[model samples]
Target: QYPIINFTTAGATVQSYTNFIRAVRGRLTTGADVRHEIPVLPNRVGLPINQRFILVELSNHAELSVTLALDVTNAYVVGYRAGNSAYFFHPDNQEDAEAITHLFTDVQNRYTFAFGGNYDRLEQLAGNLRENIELGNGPLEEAISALYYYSTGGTQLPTLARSFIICIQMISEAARFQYIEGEMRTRIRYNRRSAPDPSVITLENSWGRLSTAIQESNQGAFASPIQLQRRNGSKFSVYDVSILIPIIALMVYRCAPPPSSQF
Candidate 1:
């Protein structure tokens, strides 16, 4: 699971918290007025969740860190289409929202690294994901996205996945390193399961519905585990070794002798 944010730790820096709220609030649209709860790109699985996108500006008026927190009714979009209604979502349940927020914040905090301490460095981290990487078009990218949303919230996986590698171009590569390093230990199911059970189901349904796209697109290849993984990074890096482990195990099952023949 991703690290949870220590609200008290973040709250300690009033200015940082205020800055975080400000940056996040600005980026998001409130759920009430918006057509949907959050943007589909950000809200759908493999994207950002209720977690507010964060940016910590220091007393010196410089950014010290950047992070996101769980928040509902903000600018991010989530949900599927309702016939003609482009933005559709399950009714907003405060309990579910709060629950997701708690889980997301915890994961954020758990993942914090000593190297990436301030806002400026964090913004650079976000920027790197936005600018630097070349996420090729493939099933692997789709697969990585599944893991991404499973780990993060299903709200911005597309953008984040694209930016994951590009972050290496920044000065605070160490901070970026910490971000990736933390995810290795975080479990994707832990994060995804943190969402409302129904909400989680909705996202899973979304993934299932998109299978045809994957099939038609001609991605999702099962080459050597290493070859497949190299095509795209794991949703959670620590389980990096494990992601392929399952696929390999499944392969073994397929090759095993039939039960009737074993007798």
Candidate 2:
């Protein structure tokens, strides 16, 4: 049998805490609302139970830190601090906090390198997912929850499978939008009287509205500037954000063998 231990930690920075809030936001209906309670399956062998809701209060201008402790058993404990390399993961000795911090960093970097890292573009991606969530897309919800689980220190097969589907969907939608943009631009370039196709116009408008809503809900995340720093005396921050997302997804997806084969 595996050893059982309680999870606890302290001294998380504002950025890391905010990112944690962002992770929680993915599981919310609207960014303004917060879920106080999270259901946990004790021992990974029973139905999940809802734990008491705890709040993490913050001030808008103050840079502060806080301690987090959960009396959990037989579980992985993950923690991290922002703007620094300090982080910890227990049992498996994972760097849950660092990995998550790097995940966001990379996501931002990818957007920057590919699309000038425009705030609008990030809003658009968030809006796409938000729109799908509002549309009752079961897969996206599952994927978001899976991401939350992994972020919070639990890894399961369903999470990986759902994440794979979401990742594929994100890629496909991005490609489709690029194709639409290309076709529309091509049409406009050929003739002075080139009228935009009605279908494309409608699609673009819909995406625009969704992106707007996404931006409005979580504008701060997009508005904040990313900080840059050298690593190990290098001129740039290390950790390829471009490759991080897929690597993380694959890691949790294959972190453990299936239950049937575990014994």
Cα RMSD, each candidate = 19.0, 23.2
Clash number for candidate 1: 56
**Candidate 2 backbone overlaps, count:** 2
lDDT of 2 by residue, 89-203 (tens): 2323233222323322322121111221122342353443222222112333344444334433563543433343332222222222433334323332332222234333343
Candidate 1, which segments miss by more than 4 Å at Cα? 1-31, 34-70, 73-101, 104-109, 113-129, 135-263
On lDDT, the candidate that comes out on top is 2
* TM-score on alpha carbons, each prediction: 0.19, 0.19
Please provide, for model 1 over 1-263, each residue's C-alpha lDDT reduced to its tens digit, 9 standing for 90 to 100.
42222211211232433333334333432332211111111233233443433221111112122222322322222211111212112224554343343332323223212222222343354454222332211211232333234333553533433333322211112121222212211222122111112222222222222222222221233222211212133222211222322211001001112233232
Per-residue error at 193 for model 2, in Å?
Answer: 40
Model 1 residue 130 distance off true place after TM-score fit, in angstroms: 3.4
lDDT of each model, Cα atoms only?
Answer: 0.26, 0.27
